[PDB]
Design an enzyme around this catalytic site. Structure first.
Site, PDB file in Angstrom:
ATOM      1  N   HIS A  42       7.961   9.728   1.575  1.00  0.00           N
ATOM      2  CA  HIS A  42       6.940  11.377   2.493  1.00  0.00           C
ATOM      3  C   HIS A  42       5.584  12.028   1.349  1.00  0.00           C
ATOM      4  O   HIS A  42       4.943  12.419   1.358  1.00  0.00           O
ATOM      5  CB  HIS A  42       7.367  12.908   3.679  1.00  0.00           C
ATOM      6  CG  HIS A  42       8.620  11.645   4.688  1.00  0.00           C
ATOM      7  ND1 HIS A  42       8.081  12.835   5.857  1.00  0.00           N
ATOM      8  CD2 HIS A  42       8.775  10.680   5.204  1.00  0.00           C
ATOM      9  CE1 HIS A  42       8.574  11.913   6.769  1.00  0.00           C
ATOM     10  NE2 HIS A  42       9.080  10.810   5.843  1.00  0.00           N
ATOM     11  N   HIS A  93      15.222   2.211   4.748  1.00  0.00           N
ATOM     12  CA  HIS A  93      16.642   2.609   6.307  1.00  0.00           C
ATOM     13  C   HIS A  93      18.086   2.092   5.716  1.00  0.00           C
ATOM     14  O   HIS A  93      18.437   2.245   6.542  1.00  0.00           O
ATOM     15  CB  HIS A  93      16.050   1.956   7.132  1.00  0.00           C
ATOM     16  CG  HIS A  93      15.001   2.888   7.857  1.00  0.00           C
ATOM     17  ND1 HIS A  93      14.531   2.799   9.224  1.00  0.00           N
ATOM     18  CD2 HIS A  93      13.714   4.538   7.527  1.00  0.00           C
ATOM     19  CE1 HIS A  93      13.088   3.594   9.568  1.00  0.00           C
ATOM     20  NE2 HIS A  93      13.489   4.700   8.219  1.00  0.00           N
TER      21      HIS A  93
HETATM   22  C1  HEM Z   1       7.143   3.530  10.502  1.00  0.00           C
HETATM   23  C2  HEM Z   1       7.701   4.085   9.326  1.00  0.00           C
HETATM   24  C3  HEM Z   1       8.674   4.503   9.285  1.00  0.00           C
HETATM   25  C4  HEM Z   1       8.997   5.855   9.978  1.00  0.00           C
HETATM   26  C5  HEM Z   1       8.054   6.487  11.669  1.00  0.00           C
HETATM   27  C6  HEM Z   1       9.368   6.526   9.287  1.00  0.00           C
HETATM   28  C7  HEM Z   1      11.161   7.141  10.242  1.00  0.00           C
HETATM   29  C8  HEM Z   1      11.975   8.237   9.970  1.00  0.00           C
HETATM   30  C9  HEM Z   1      12.533   9.933  10.582  1.00  0.00           C
HETATM   31  C10 HEM Z   1      12.278  10.191  11.889  1.00  0.00           C
HETATM   32  C11 HEM Z   1      13.547   9.935   9.880  1.00  0.00           C
HETATM   33  C12 HEM Z   1      14.758  10.765   9.912  1.00  0.00           C
HETATM   34  C13 HEM Z   1      14.340  12.592   9.498  1.00  0.00           C
HETATM   35  C14 HEM Z   1      15.348  12.988  10.044  1.00  0.00           C
HETATM   36  O1  HEM Z   1      15.628  13.166  11.438  1.00  0.00           O
HETATM   37  O2  HEM Z   1      16.116  13.654   9.093  1.00  0.00           O
HETATM   38  C15 HEM Z   1      13.680   8.541   8.633  1.00  0.00           C
HETATM   39  C16 HEM Z   1      14.364   8.845   7.264  1.00  0.00           C
HETATM   40  C17 HEM Z   1      14.721   8.419   6.436  1.00  0.00           C
HETATM   41  N1  HEM Z   1      13.568   7.521   5.785  1.00  0.00           N
HETATM   42 FE1  HEM Z   1      12.282   6.944   8.268  1.00  0.00          FE
HETATM   43  N2  HEM Z   1      10.017   6.055   8.620  1.00  0.00           N
HETATM   44  C18 HEM Z   1       9.629   5.085   8.288  1.00  0.00           C
HETATM   45  C19 HEM Z   1      10.040   4.493   6.848  1.00  0.00           C
HETATM   46  C20 HEM Z   1      10.520   4.871   5.521  1.00  0.00           C
HETATM   47  C21 HEM Z   1       9.717   4.241   4.733  1.00  0.00           C
HETATM   48  C22 HEM Z   1       9.085   3.263   3.768  1.00  0.00           C
HETATM   49  C23 HEM Z   1      11.349   5.266   3.377  1.00  0.00           C
HETATM   50  C24 HEM Z   1      11.189   4.267   1.600  1.00  0.00           C
HETATM   51  C25 HEM Z   1      11.465   3.515   0.767  1.00  0.00           C
HETATM   52  C26 HEM Z   1      11.651   5.218   4.005  1.00  0.00           C
HETATM   53  C27 HEM Z   1      13.208   6.373   4.058  1.00  0.00           C
HETATM   54  C28 HEM Z   1      14.153   7.052   4.873  1.00  0.00           C
HETATM   55  C29 HEM Z   1      15.656   7.034   4.044  1.00  0.00           C
HETATM   56  C30 HEM Z   1      16.171   7.221   3.340  1.00  0.00           C
HETATM   57  C31 HEM Z   1      15.671   8.256   5.396  1.00  0.00           C
HETATM   58  C32 HEM Z   1      16.726   8.923   5.564  1.00  0.00           C
HETATM   59  C33 HEM Z   1      16.769  10.608   5.209  1.00  0.00           C
HETATM   60  C34 HEM Z   1      18.936  11.320   4.902  1.00  0.00           C
HETATM   61  O3  HEM Z   1      20.112  10.927   4.849  1.00  0.00           O
HETATM   62  O4  HEM Z   1      18.429  12.528   4.771  1.00  0.00           O
HETATM   63  N3  HEM Z   1      11.587   5.464   5.609  1.00  0.00           N
HETATM   64  N4  HEM Z   1      12.614   7.891   9.054  1.00  0.00           N
END
Ligand code: HEM
Ligand code: HEM
Lengths: 714, 714
Positions: free
Chosen positions: B79, B242
């Site tokens: 972010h 993800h």
């Molecule tokens: C169309 C784009 C995407 C959407 C809308 C999105 C979505 C989301 C949402 C809703 C969450 C969870 C927040 C939460 O409940 O804690 C999350 C996180 C997560 N995202 Fe995405 N994301 C995108 C992509 C990406 C990208 C490009 C990366 C980084 C290279 C990334 C990586 C991560 C990681 C590692 C987690 C999990 C964090 C954790 O355990 O606490 N994501 N994402």
């Protein structure tokens, strides 16, 4: 479209932008540009001579009333200064800010855009040698002299601003010409200089739009009071002012006039309030929607206003502009005044409700009767009030520049006596410094005292400061926040040292108490910085004098009394705003940036100059030792904070594990770990390699303040 | 109780606040502070070691999911940089503005405050050796690495800011988590890098909270597209990202989550989204509302994500937070994941509409399946994408510091070749100037070309500039604003000079065309200043090189094409916003202050360098003669303004008296005479003593812009 500020998403967001205005200086003016020196080169007479001619040199885009711009100019100068409040010392003619929004588009300032524009050639002809600020006031002086009245004097030195003053809160109103600041006449909200948003003082038709003279006088009284003026002064100014010119309300403003400057079309070039039928008006000029002149010779000095008001009966009515105004009941005055722009026409004099008020109110009536009786008496009251009004926010006598400055110094200028002796040398200083440090005065007593002395300064009207030792005089010596009895103990020790030093001398050399107070504070800070292993030489500028009660209009200093004092962690128990907002607001008066305020308070807590010697915000184990302990400990996540039960300003810092109380604090302390911009500064200083940086920033800030009022050597 | 800014009274008032940010540097950092230098002192290896350690050091105030903060940190860096937009180069992480509002309080950044908090001890330990901006991205890196995945590299150099970028326009919406920017998925409003106000890219539940995997892909593509990412990159990033962590939402955050950082209590010390039922709970954790992991091993890099998404089928279902999410149709994957905090519990995987949009959309599936086949291709793309994502707003190679910067220079860095020859001395520099002034090229032409060569610079992502001379390559050589055929000619003459110069060198010295372009302007500006009686020598920095089409992503340069250009008075007849608004916006990309802009344009019109050589704003009688004639004639009341008949940008300046047409201009010209603050500056320069000042202020501004991209000298 346009963006969306953070104040829109979160209304309560601390407004640190007022401190940012202190960081830089928007505008194309050199940093080493000394306006005083430039004015010092001006040929005031040539300017006054040129203004003389302008007075009767009508331009077609805004034909002069009676072939004389005098009256209009006066209203312009009087409005340029009239926005001044004593509560914070903001507003006024000091920066010539009438030129920027929102002021330049205030309803009350209608058509003043055209009056300023008229001065544009002369302003360009002399350039930097005369500010718009000094110019607008002088344009009033010349206007007044040209129409047969001598002014008490004139002074230059007002430096132009290049933007509005973001610090000024003009009120709670959400719309111009409406009010939400008073339920009863004479009961306006604290700190405001007007009874209506967008107006200088009061509603010319009467309170809330009612032609109630008696009621009007109550708001006139309070508003003017909040502007450092009494009955004599108020009456003289209102009457002397309306002795000239007229009010323009050919038709209703709410339908015949275009947007204010700020909302006007770009091809208007700064002008605004364009009349639907045209702006090169005369017999159709509209400003406030009220019509008619006050006297028979609107361009001449005389007893016309007072005589018309006191010698004839007036009746309320609805003028051609659909606004309240009054007319005589007799036919004696009917058509006795020539039309502003027409030969084959006369106009009947009129009177505003605010004018009838000087007659209906019993106290204003005594004062007015006196005047009608002695034209000489009314003349001087007006001459002196006008001079005070237009120079009130310039500071002490040292700041008034030029050949027309009266030799006489007024009390409102907070004059300082001359130091008739020789200034202490580099050797006496170190001498007295040790002498002080040998006394029983603690580092917290010396710091607290020097803070009380210098913190009364406010950049808005250049009042207050540590020069004069007014802290020992009334009313400051009795202010709750200065802990009167505590202060007395310190002042005694210093006065003794002053006596002893003054006596032992055999060369006319003496040291002022005001000087010792600050020096004793620089020593305390150096000592606090020494207890942390830092050798610092705080710059000391000897020269401050001790002012006497004869140089202090005691009641007028009550305005500088703080409701909150970050450094001493003092919060009056009744403030409406949250402590931090006042903190920021007060900081702005000391010209501090968000960083400078942060270093100050932070460094302070490590020392411990708290009010009533509390521990609120004192996050250190080694008090009187200048360190970055405040930031380190504040930012420690190991500690968690929560409001103190049954407390209004106190908070507890608990060990997130054991639950034990580690510290106590106020919003003043916690704000630097909550606000996002400030927390960001607290992290720099709280870093492992920044203590020396903090020590040095704190000292710099401390030194800046101690010298804020040192105008003589700037 | 707060000053009701001019913003509320006049929602259309030009926002000069962004140019004011360039006049000062808020924050407690010295002027002579070289971050890139303090960074060189940083033992990066030590930092990474402590970062990997922190990964498994759970804090009771926010328990580490699965016992590893890695995933959470990956999101933090994600972010942090994912707000970047190519349109203006704004957003990104080059300033670390995620710490400041409104970003730090965006719904999409819920709990990321705790994430930045976990890094406080480290940031403090190293102080000025590592900025927050560099620390956040370095944490994401170190997070991935410790989870079995090497990163393509890492470069420090991102300077920490101390406030938000008031220049960024996040959208027209009036509320968070609501969009008024697009009807159909893929018809987003140009200029915006997100489909919903407050989100990084799009809504995880699909367009308008509708689980339409197809429509979601339509926006997923426009967003990443507007962020300089294609399909492959978009797929790799999302998928690789993800492969870690989970989505939190044990309950509805709409009713179980406290105020966001900016609106939270002062006792919460800058933190927000306080869990109503235990924030230290862990088992009960709510962020976005959606609950569940993507893989069965959230703390291990692998094909878990792509395997689960492609090998099985999912179906829509409102989760335990009222949000849209999916789950396995088959009960094979049930409880295939260990519980994040409860050692005695398992949990079933889930996919977001955004993760199903990759399966449905044609071009996406193709990629996802190619990845599943070649685990290596997935790696090479993700590693390289993650490196491009967190470094694309840092600028050219010149700005990439540290011991982990890849040797292979990427195309998005807009590389510049090394000069394979000797630079020119003051001797040759002098000749070259006298030679360019001997050609048949006019001051106008020379000035115009130099401006076209440098005006493309933008401080946001450090792209564009006069170094590399991309002006002669695609697409710039064919930009309407540059007048292709005209530019064609000027360059030819300059190239012929480059030629005759290099061939006559009895040594190795050679001059680039890039340098010659800028050396032409400088000399032309001095000539113009000479025709006005002012002898000025503009500082020139030789050393620029000529970039080729080989290492130039021509298409990625379109984002540097302006729609407005005040220096040349160019206005695209399609610009939605008023010209002056864009004028200000661009002036911020050049780091100019209200003043600088003003001097720049005013001085430029006296020189005459308009697009198509029009006489718009050229209020002078002797073009190519640098004077203050623009301000003198714009301020002369003898002239009146009004909109031109049948013209969009045209305004005519008539003679108030005769009515004869005196001048012609556009909003860009007239704004300096309408806006209150700008006009204040115009009066300074238009005075009878400002000319020399304007000439010098002009040169300094022009000289500055010409060097904006010279980082190599910094
Ligand atoms: C169309 C784009 C995407 C959407 C809308 C999105 C979505 C989301 C949402 C809703 C969450 C969870 C927040 C939460 O409940 O804690 C999350 C996180 C997560 N995202 Fe995405 N994301 C995108 C992509 C990406 C990208 C490009 C990366 C980084 C290279 C990334 C990586 C991560 C990681 C590692 C987690 C999990 C964090 C954790 O355990 O606490 N994501 N994402
Ligand atoms: C209780 C405070 C007062 C009230 C409400 C008030 C009132 C008004 C109103 C409504 C107008 C007419 C403007 C227009 O339509 O053009 C005007 C102006 C005028 N004012 Fe007063 N004012 C106050 C006092 C002051 C003072 C304190 C002085 C100066 C020392 C002065 C000054 C003048 C002069 C010279 C004019 C007429 C200008 C002209 O003919 O262009 N005023 N005022």
């Amino acid at each position: 479209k346009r963006p969306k500020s953070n104040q829109d998403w979160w209304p309560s967001k601390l407004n640190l932008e007022i401190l940012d205005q202190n960081a830089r200086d928007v505008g194309p003016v050199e940093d080493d540009f000394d306006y005083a020196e430039e004015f010092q080169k001006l040929d005031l007479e040539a300017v006054k001579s040129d203004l003389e001619e302008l007075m009767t040199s009508s331009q077609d885009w805004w034909p002069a009333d009676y072939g004389h711009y005098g009256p209009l100019f006066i209203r312009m100068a009087w409005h340029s200064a009239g926005t001044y409040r004593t509560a914070d010392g903001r507003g006024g003619a000091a920066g010539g800010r009438q030129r920027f929004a929102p002021i330049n588009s205030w309803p009350d300032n209608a058509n003043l855009d055209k009056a300023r524009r008229l001065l544009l050639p002369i302003k360009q002809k002399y350039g930097q040698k005369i500010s718009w600020a000094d110019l607008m006031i002088l344009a009033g002086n010349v206007a007044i002299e040209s129409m047969g009245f001598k002014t008490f004097g004139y002074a230059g030195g007002r430096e132009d601003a290049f933007e509005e003053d973001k610090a000024v809160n003009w009120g709670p109103e959400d719309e111009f010409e409406t009010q939400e600041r008073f339920d009863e006449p004479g009961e306006i909200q604290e700190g405001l200089g007007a009874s209506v948003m967008g107006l200088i003082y009061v509603n010319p038709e009467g309170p809330d739009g009612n032609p109630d003279p008696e009621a009007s006088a109550k708001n006139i009284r309070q508003t003017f009071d909040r502007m450092a003026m009494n009955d004599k002064e108020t009456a003289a100014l209102i009457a002397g002012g309306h002795t000239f010119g007229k009010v323009h309300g050919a038709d209703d403003p709410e339908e015949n006039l275009g947007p204010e400057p700020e909302a006007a079309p770009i091809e208007q070039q700064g002008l605004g309030w364009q009349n639907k039928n045209g702006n090169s008006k005369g017999g159709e000029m509209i400003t406030t929607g009220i019509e008619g002149p006050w006297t028979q010779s609107p361009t001449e000095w005389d007893m016309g206003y007072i005589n018309n008001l006191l010698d004839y009966e007036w009746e309320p009515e609805k003028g051609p502009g659909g606004a309240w105004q009054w007319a005589p009941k007799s036919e004696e005055l009917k058509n006795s005044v020539p039309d502003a722009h027409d030969p084959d026409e006369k106009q009947t004099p009129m009177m505003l409700t605010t004018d009838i008020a000087l007659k209906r109110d019993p106290d204003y009536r005594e004062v007015m009767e006196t005047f009608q009786e002695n034209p000489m008496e009314f003349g001087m009251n007006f001459a002196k009030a006008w001079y005070k009004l237009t120079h009130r926010d310039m500071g002490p006598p040292e700041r008034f520049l030029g050949p027309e400055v009266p030799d006489e110094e007024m009390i409102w200028q907070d004059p300082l006596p001359d130091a008739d002796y020789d200034l202490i040398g580099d050797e006496e200083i170190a001498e007295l410094k040790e002498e002080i440090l040998d006394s029983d005065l603690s580092v917290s007593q010396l710091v607290k005292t020097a803070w009380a002395s210098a913190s009364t300064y406010r950049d808005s009207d250049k009042r207050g400061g540590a020069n004069g030792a007014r802290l020992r005089l009334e009313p400051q010596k009795n202010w709750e926040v200065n802990e009167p009895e505590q202060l007395e103990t310190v002042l005694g020790t210093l006065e003794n040292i002053q006596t002893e030093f003054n006596d032992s001398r055999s060369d006319g050399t003496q040291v002022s108490l005001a000087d010792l107070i600050v020096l004793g504070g620089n020593a305390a800070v150096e000592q606090a910085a020494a207890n942390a292993g830092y050798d610092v030489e705080i710059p000391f500028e000897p020269g401050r004098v001790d002012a006497g009660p004869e140089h202090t209009d005691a009641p007028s200093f009550d305005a500088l009394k703080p409701k909150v004092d970050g450094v001493r962690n003092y919060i009056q128990d009744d403030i409406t705003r949250p402590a931090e907002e006042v903190l920021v607001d007060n900081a702005d008066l000391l010209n501090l940036t968000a960083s400078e305020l942060t270093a100050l308070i932070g460094g302070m807590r490590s020392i411990g100059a708290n009010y009533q010697d509390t521990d609120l915000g004192v996050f250190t184990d080694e008090p009187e030792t200048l360190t970055n302990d405040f930031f380190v400990n504040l930012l420690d996540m190991g500690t968690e904070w929560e409001p103190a039960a049954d407390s209004e300003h106190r908070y507890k810092g608990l060990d997130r594990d054991t639950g034990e109380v580690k510290w106590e604090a106020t919003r003043i302390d916690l704000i630097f770990g909550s606000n996002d911009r400030l927390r960001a500064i607290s992290e720099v200083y709280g870093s492992a390699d920044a203590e020396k940086k903090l020590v040095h920033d704190f000292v710099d800030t401390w030194s800046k303040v101690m010298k804020l009022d040192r105008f003589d050597l700037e």
